[PDB]
């Protein structure tokens with residue numbers, strides 16, 4: 001049984017870390033953190049990591065490597081292997097659907113960063129003057145820059161209008177993903193991680209350091225880190241703090257996307273996954289809390305003050321990353337260069353991720369329909385590139401996909417993979433597989449944390465918010481399409497049966 | 499099993515006639531005829547039939563039976579068999595796409611007729627009073643009845659809102675198609691034709707006769723037939739008269755839909771197709787010109803006068819069939835029963851057609867992906883039922899599909915199948931195959947009419963109107979989806995290659 005396998009431990013680890021350490025860590029985490037009060041977030045975030053992130057990851061690595069040894073890297077096949085049943089194959093489809101759909105808006109956002117980076121380099125960006133009473137006059141220019149890039153509706157009709165440059169950069173971005181994926185796990189995804197992850201780190205640290213030195217009449221970067229890392233044991237009982245948290249742990253760690261599983265399916269039948277997994281997870285938590293957390297917020301707080309901060313977070317993940325930060329940098333020395341690094345950092349962080357959520361579909365086509373990698377890769381590119389047109393042109397199409405696939409879906413799927421592995425398959429058999437070949441071993445306690453805690457924890461979540469009715473008629477367009485994708489992925493699964 | 503084959507000659511013929519004699523003959527033909535002046539139409543219609551309808555049909559029967567003997571009933575495989583090439587398989591995809599797409603709005607319209615029939619029977623329809631100065635007060639009620647049925651936008655947003663009864667009747671209608679198709683060619687499509695076609699005929703004649711006796715202060719049915727069958731050799735040079743005509747010949751005869759081909763693929767390798775084809779075609783021309791032509795128009799002319807007629811035709815195929823006619827009948831004795839027969843007639847006529855344009859997809863799944871009929875039938879039902887939601891809810895989605903697949907596509911495909919058969923494959927080899935097993939033989943002359951005339955004729959058409967770009971932003975939604983269907987059918991074709 002061929003199937004590719006990680007060339008080297010480090011190569012593996014870094015690919016996996018690149019799987020997780022994406023636009024989420026940098027655009028999304030900062031916003032979640034400052035939205036809920038800041039110090040109210042960092043704690044539930046860490047716990048959820050210990051109580052959900054870790055347990056769930058070891059599980060995915062385990063299911064991935066387990067299936068890998070039998071020729072299967074995706075969840076319709078894997079779910080069925082562990083749990084012989086028809087309903088297994090059907091639920092397994094979400095491990096193709098979620099990545100596919102997320103990939104469909106992700107690579108587009110990823111392409112923005114590239115486009116800004118190019119324009120910053122060449123200095124085709126706005127360079128507003130110094131204003132000490134018209135902050136509006138510094139944001140406005142940057143605000144108009146993004147809106148013109150993506151074609152934000154100026155009237156009403158929920159219709160976007162990408163620039164030719166935005167569209168063309170999307171093509172380039174897709175091409176780059178293909179050029180990487182079309183080389184496979186080691187000679188492609190792995191080769192790229194070894195180059196990209198270090199690069200990403202240095203850019204990240206540099207910006208972290210450089211942002212730390214930020215200081216204006218309105219505050220200091222220091223004040224932002226304080227706001228993030230100074231606890232508030234009050235709220236911490238209001239559990240919207242544990243919804244944002246547990247939920248963020250999924251996206252940030254790429255859990256419930258079928259992706260960790262697919263990558264793990266390349267790991268040799270007897271290679272360690274206990275230490276490797278733990279290492280990668282940790283790199284991710286570092287990249288988020290230290291790196292991601294210490295750039296945009298501390299910078300915004302430095303320029304706007306700590307109160308005008310929670311409001312900026314509430315403004316959304318795109319305002320901060322694509323409007324506010326660039327506006328801030330434009331007021332600091334050599335700030336045009338600071339924007340470039342930022343967007344190049346985001347780009348490489350996006351790229352190491354997008355290739356991860358495109359692999360499940362590619363792996364399925366090779367494993368189950370027996371396509372050549374070239375074909376498996378190009379058809380997946382076609383489906384993603386084609387489908388992304390809905391995201392580029394239809395207002396709030398992105399929000400809708402992000403919600404169903406990227407927010408709800410991952411959690412339900414997280415809970416589902418756990419139940420199939422640690423309950424249906426056999427908690428004991430699962431615990432052994434997870435520990436087999438372990439350079440280190442899983443602290444026993446965890447066995448009880450995945451067989452009862454983790455699943456309970458998730459059940460409570462899915463129950464709480466689920467406790468609690470219209471919306472633009474256009475959401476139904478996006479909902480129609482992605483439901484269509486499911487019907488279609490299900491059909492393909494049905495065809496792989498003979 | 500080498501595939502199903504028509505049980506009996508008559509069974510075959512009638513299935514084929516049922517293939518062609520659909521809602522087109524009754525809702526569409528009458529409107530095309532009266533739109534252009536009436537007498538200006540009947541002549542170019544007949545010629546086009548002799549010069550395009552006939553030649554093209556014999557070709558499709560021939561390609562169908564040719565592929566059938568080799569296990570293939572659809573055009574991606576057949577096109578490739580006659581013309582060894584990759585581009586052959588790709589163009590062949592339109593023989594799956596056109597039927598699929600047309601089926602996607604057709605079965606919905608078909609379902610309307612059923613729904614009205616039920617409501618007429620039970621008398622849940624409007625029964626306006628007698629008005630001799632407020633014709634508006636007789637149409638209005640009927641107008642509101644259809645609009646409420648399909649949920650015609652009362653404000654602006656291009657959004658439909660089917661009634662629960664409309665929606666449920668669509669389910670029933672889909673179920674009826676499935677119950678038929680899921681039994682196969684002979685024990686299903688054939689069994690049904692033998693029952694449906696005679697039934698359809700008697701209803702049709704009865705209405706023809708009963709409409710003939712129509713007479714009001716404003717005109718007589720007689721005047722309508724006169725208007726249709728009294729020539730106007732002037733216009734007859736304005737060739738929008740040959741665009742409506744040649745174009746109508748396609749829909750009316752089900753040419754360029756891949757459907758005639760699929761059915762023919764069941765005909766035994768050595769069964770006659772020269773006489774059988776000629777017979778069926780003719781039944782269709784009868785059903786159209788005598789039957790279809792003598793009901794709605796003569797009735798409208800009887801009640802509204804011959805001048806207020808061309809205007810009603812211009813109002814569209816749905817006004818006449820679903821609003822105007824029912825309004826007219828409501829003013830004649832036992833008219834509530836006349837509406838029932840009409841809609842039951844349309845229903846049976848729609849049903850014998852919808853099963854025809856669903857078979858190409860079903861045949862492909864069996865022939866190329868080796869699915870069981872049950873599965874091939876249910877998956878095709880799923881794709882059609884799912885996709886029709888776009889048609890039920892999005893205003894002008896139907897128009898768009900009808901245009902690209904049902905109007906443009908058929909013609910281009912007509913011309914394409916001809917070129918591949920009578921040019922690439924070999925005009926001589928084609929002529930022999932078409933004549934092999936012929937109970938009668940093709941009048942030689944035709945050889946030159948398909949090898950030069952027919953193709954030229956079509957080229958001129960495609961060129962003329964093509965001689966001469968905004969519109970609601972919603973057309974792009976439908977255009978996006980159906981392009982998606984193509985990408986998807988192409989992918990399936992790619993998979994059947996191993």
Ligand SMILES: CCCCCCCCO[C@@H]1O[C@H](CO)[C@@H](O)[C@H](O)[C@H]1O
Pocket residue numbers: 023024027028106109315316317318398399402
């Ligand atoms: C992939 C990592 C980044 C994901 C970003 C997805 C954030 C989608 O967030 C959306 O942004 C919109 C515009 O501000 C708002 O209108 C919506 O309320 C909000 O849900």
Ligand SMILES: CCCCCCCCO[C@@H]1O[C@H](CO)[C@@H](O)[C@H](O)[C@H]1O
Pocket residue numbers: 161162163164165167386389
């Ligand atoms: C493969 C699916 C193709 C769908 C049609 C894509 C049409 C792309 O259209 C492009 O969009 C850009 C952004 O609005 C515009 O700048 C350009 O005018 C236009 O060429």
Ligand SMILES: CCCCCCCCO[C@@H]1O[C@H](CO)[C@@H](O)[C@H](O)[C@H]1O
Pocket residue numbers: 389390393394967974975978
């Ligand atoms: C909602 C589904 C995504 C499809 C949207 C495609 C946007 C079409 O955009 C169109 O492209 C044409 C040709 O490229 C140009 O002629 C027009 O300028 C432009 O309106």
Ligand SMILES: CCCCCCCCO[C@@H]1O[C@H](CO)[C@@H](O)[C@H](O)[C@H]1O
Pocket residue numbers: 050051442443444445446449
């Ligand atoms: C809820 C998960 C808590 C994670 C912290 C576990 C830290 C490891 O904890 C250690 O594990 C060893 C092996 O099980 C034991 O010998 C020790 O009792 C324990 O200190």
Ligand SMILES: CCCCCCCCO[C@@H]1O[C@H](CO)[C@@H](O)[C@H](O)[C@H]1O
Pocket residue numbers: 520521522523525526607814815816897900
């Ligand atoms: C026999 C199959 C019935 C379907 C044919 C009727 C569908 C045509 O639909 C019509 O299209 C016209 C052109 O866009 C519009 O002017 C009309 O509003 C619309 O009713």
Ligand SMILES: CCCCCCCCO[C@@H]1O[C@H](CO)[C@@H](O)[C@H](O)[C@H]1O
Pocket residue numbers: 480483659660661662663665884887
């Ligand atoms: C595969 C289909 C995806 C879209 C879900 C279709 C749900 C439509 O469903 C129905 O539509 C009817 C007509 O408007 C209404 O009468 C009913 O309220 C509703 O149940």
Ligand SMILES: CCCCCCCCO[C@@H]1O[C@H](CO)[C@@H](O)[C@H](O)[C@H]1O
Pocket residue numbers: 469470476477480887888891892
């Ligand atoms: C192309 C769009 C096809 C999708 C069909 C959307 C039908 C809307 O669906 C309906 O919406 C109502 C109000 O939101 C709800 O009360 C019902 O649950 C639901 O049936």
Ligand SMILES: CCCCCCCCO[C@@H]1O[C@H](CO)[C@@H](O)[C@H](O)[C@H]1O
Pocket residue numbers: 548549940941942943944947
């Ligand atoms: C526009 C094309 C109309 C063709 C009508 C064909 C009428 C039959 O035409 C006949 O065909 C026979 C066989 O070739 C010949 O033997 C006869 O001489 C000829 O009259």
Ligand SMILES: CC(C)C[C@H](N)C(=O)O
Pocket residue numbers: 019020021022023024025102251252253254257259353354356357
């Ligand atoms: C969808 C995931 C691959 C995203 C990635 N884990 C991130 O944090 O951005």
Ligand SMILES: CC(C)C[C@H](N)C(=O)O
Pocket residue numbers: 517518519520521522523600749750751752755757851852854855
């Ligand atoms: C699509 C075709 C089956 C339509 C049919 N020939 C009709 O005239 O109604």
Ligand code: NA
Pocket residue numbers: 017018019020021022023348349350351352353354
């Ligand atoms: Na990444």
Ligand code: NA
Pocket residue numbers: 515516517518519520521846847848849850851852
């Ligand atoms: Na019919």
